[PDB]
Design a protein around this nucleic acid. Structure first.
Ligand SMILES: [Zn+2]
Length: 91
DNA sequence: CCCAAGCG
DNA sequence: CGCTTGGG
């Protein structure tokens, strides 16, 4: 059961591991906590995705369309409008 | 110049 | 953890 987060980007310095394009400050982003090959030195760090790019990879990231949004830690803290958009985007 | 939030 | 850099 890989663990997931959802939040508004704290900054514009993070990069979407999907499209490899930088995410903008304030933009809704999703993460799988997960060791990096490069820095196993680091333990379980966040890998961030555009919700779209995330969705592209539900399988490879081990997303459980069953449980749904509830499984994204922090999902409840989002604007109602934003909460909605995701529910839709979701398997 | 400065330095800790942010990220990786 | 250590580095880069937003935000002073
Ligand atoms: Zn992306």
């Amino acid at each position: 059961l890989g663990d997931f987060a959802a939040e508004y980007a704290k900054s514009n310095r993070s990069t979407c591991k999907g499209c490899m394009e930088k995410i903008e400050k304030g933009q809704v982003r999703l993460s799988k906590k997960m060791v990096d090959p490069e820095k196993p030195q680091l333990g379980m760090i966040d890998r961030w995705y555009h919700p779209g790019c995330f969705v592209k990879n539900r399988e490879e990231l081990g997303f459980r369309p069953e449980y749904s949004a509830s499984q994204l830690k922090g999902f409840s803290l989002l604007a109602t409008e934003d909460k909605e958009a995701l529910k839709k985007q979701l398997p």
